[PDB]
Amino acid sequence: LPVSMTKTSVDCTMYICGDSTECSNLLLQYGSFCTQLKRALTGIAVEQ
Amino acid sequence: LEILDITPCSFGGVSVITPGTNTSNQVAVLYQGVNCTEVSVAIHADQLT
Ligand SMILES: *[C@@H]1O[C@H](CO)[C@@H](O)[C@H](O)[C@H]1NC(C)=O
């Protein structure tokens, strides 16, 4: 019986816009879309 | 005409340990998945974002 999976901590800016200030700025125009993803990944780690 | 690799800068994560601010104000910091002999020289170079 499996008990847990590998815990992941993907990051919005580093994954999407690697060290690009303009790209990060245009990501900020998307609102808090990805803070949800960070919170959900923290959650999945916590449940593991 | 030689071969050179390419590596991540230092990509990692920062987690902050703290008791309730109603209890104290001291903090201790984490640096996720990075040998921090590398950040110890990094703070000396002040290259830490
Ligand atoms: C990470 O740990 C120490 C401290 O830096 C050193 O042996 C070396 O940098 C790394 N060791 C391994 C086994 O990756």
Side-chain angles (χ1 to χ4, degrees), chain A residues 14 19, chain B residues 9 11:
Chain A
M14 292 326 167
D19 304 330
Chain B
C9 326
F11 293 0

Side-chain angles (χ1 to χ4, degrees), chain B residues 34-38:
Chain B
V34 154
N35 262 355
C36 78
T37 65
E38 283 71 344

Side-chain angles (χ1 to χ4, degrees), chain A residues 8-27:
Chain A
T8 304
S9 154
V10 79
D11 198 359
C12 304
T13 291
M14 292 326 167
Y15 170 62
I16 304 199
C17 303
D19 304 330
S20 285
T21 167
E22 291 68 30
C23 197
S24 39
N25 295 332
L26 291 211
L27 178 57

